[PDB]
Amino acid sequence: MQSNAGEFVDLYVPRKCSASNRIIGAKDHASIPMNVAEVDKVTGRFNGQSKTYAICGAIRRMGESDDSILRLAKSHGIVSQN
């Protein structure tokens, strides 16, 4: 958040989950980032740069996460057709 002074106020900007486009708390203990490791996709070996996601605790605890992680990954690798 930016004032007319140009002072960039607010203690931190909180992360916004890709599960359902909404923002998690600071004591929500069911909200998990999950790092998937990319591979070269020519031999099948680790290659550097991870794809990281984040999911909110609310959709997790009702049990929607299995579809959400699949849908996110389906538009990338290592699922492209299921």
Binding site: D10, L11, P14, P33
Partner: protein, 226 residues
Amino acid sequence: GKAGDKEWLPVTKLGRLVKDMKIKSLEEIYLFSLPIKESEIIDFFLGAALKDKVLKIMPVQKQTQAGQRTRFKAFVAIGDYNGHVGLGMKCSKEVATAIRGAIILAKLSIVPVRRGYWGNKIGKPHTVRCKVTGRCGSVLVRLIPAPRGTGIISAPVPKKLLLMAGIDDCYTSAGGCTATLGNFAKATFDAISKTYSYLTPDLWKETVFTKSPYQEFTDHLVKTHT
């Protein structure tokens, strides 16, 4: 001298990164919404601005065949005026021990508050981001934004909490019983918590994402470390 000190040895992973000094703000912890379990972590980043304000020391008691048996339950607030506040309740057989038990529990539950402006910016926030609520068992508070210089207009009990939060100007409205202050104070605390969980058009820009402090500093967490 002839007397050392030795204070705190962490047995917790999060505690170990702080003691070895790789995490350097509370803001790192909160962004991953990590558990806190040790009350020295919070008192290391802060503890140079934390005050306590013992609200009530209330008796409760159960019944047995030999008569009464009385335990003392006290509520204790905690907060710096920079926007971190917390709250805890605890009970014990004796008074002083219960108070000191509450100052520990209160440190554990500290959270940040998000402050904003009435409608025009001039630097340094002074009020609550938006009109929010919070209910605890049919007590509720409705923190409503207010322009500068109107002070905190509330009952004496929430006037403690909001003042400790550093929120300068506010209007409030209550509903239902408020003479059972254990609910009343928790309901205030509930309301101030929700501020960062309220989505605003400001926050619609996308967050970059970054690897966990646990992840990046894992090479220091494995050598002999917990």
